[PDB]
Symmetry: C3
Subunit: 176 residues, 3 copies
């Protein structure tokens, strides 16, 4: 048993709208691969807010069904998520559940467990400005969702109009 790889594609186009935004104004480069029990995530985000949002934090939620497909309520455009085949996405995902966060380790809708979060930080293009990122495993999700993956970015002060981050990695326990 070798597991599939779920991703947004290597070099995707604008594929994420942010809270209170009309059209998609950011690119999310997410990719999940697995060995043994462990899923490994790689992440990089860049966007530009069309409005100066009065708030030091800004977030972005992924919600998945039982097979690992992204649900429409997510901040990611459905089109931009699938299985890795070479340098492309394969659209109808199969056996995605294996790359999702383990439901016993990271119980659904329980926000009070530190053990279900990953705190990390990413560097920003301009200056040595750092963004804190907080990833939430199964913590933030809608009734319809089976799994989840929340990304919350806090800025040193007020978010810039435009930003790109570096490549940030993370690991967590896979389901099954």
């Amino acid at each position: 048993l070798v597991y599939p790889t779920l991703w947004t594609g290597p070099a995707p186009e604008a594929n994420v709208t942010f809270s209170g935004e009309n059209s998609p104004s950011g690119i999310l480069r997410l990719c999940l691969s697995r060995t043994g029990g462990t899923v490994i995530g790689t992440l990089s985000v860049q966007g530009s807010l069309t409005n100066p949002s009065t708030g030091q934090t800004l977030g972005m939620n992924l919600y998945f069904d039982a097979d690992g497909n992204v649900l429409s309520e997510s901040n990611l455009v459905r089109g931009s998520w699938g299985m890795k085949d070479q340098d492309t996405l394969v659209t109808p995902i199969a056996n995605g559940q294996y790359l999702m966060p383990n439901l016993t380790a990271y119980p659904r809708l329980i926000q009070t467990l530190t053990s279900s979060y990953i705190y990390t930080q990413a560097h920003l293009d301009h200056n040595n400005s750092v963004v804190d990122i907080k990833i939430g495993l199964n913590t933030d999700l809608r009734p319809t969702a089976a799994y989840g993956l929340s990304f919350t970015m806090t800025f040193t002060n007020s978010p810039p109009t435009s930003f790109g981050t570096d490549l940030v990695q993370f690991g967590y326990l896979g389901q099954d």
Copy 2:
């Protein structure tokens, strides 16, 4: 060749006894998977100390035999370390050596090599306080032990009565 996965299970109960403590009062969520020559670890820790520990540091040591079994003298109760089968533990570990720290990269009982340590840090439930973890590969071990992982946690001042960390990750070169 596909390697096995060793872990404390996905949602273990109290399973570590901290130095100077009578009963297990801490939960260690550890998991080691592998591809190629690299072993990937995920760590998350929660504890509470029945007495107020006069000391900034707080450690816990794992000692393994040749097959990758946790030895009695470890801070982990040995009932709580096994192979992954779905969400369960399998108690006779077979071929665990592949997840142990490479004996040539990280020689036994040589504490003077920086290359044998991983310095990382975790976030603590309360505020955002950090705690510095220092994993030591084969550095701290008993005579009878074959391999070792030692975790030391330095708190910014004095350890709290109770605490839970986020999910931390680390990689190292595997044996064989």
Copy 3:
């Protein structure tokens, strides 16, 4: 598919020459393994400068051909890069492209994309000094190089006459 593992070996001898030095005065411990779409790197560096360097930063470039062998112009001596067979190093590298950074995600010769970089940090043996490490995916190349992987270490003041880092990890998306 099961991908190979490329590395400098587990406990290599002096195998890297720093920009300006005539002989190798450094030890690079690097290993790349892969699972699914993700390549996972481990890194620790030890070196000493035979002169006092007027330069706060310090850097070493790896340049690879189509199969993932290191070219001569790389700061790493060629002798010290190969495939993993247990604790040894196998020299005709076959099928190494899979461990190299994906060319669609991390375009060649392009340095203005933050997404092509991995900012991280290592701890230095003496005190709790950190050194900032910036890995560049295909950003620094020679006309002959197919792929590239550049490490730049910025020190808090001038770089010391000798140093050793702890073990540091990163992930990126692999080619094919």
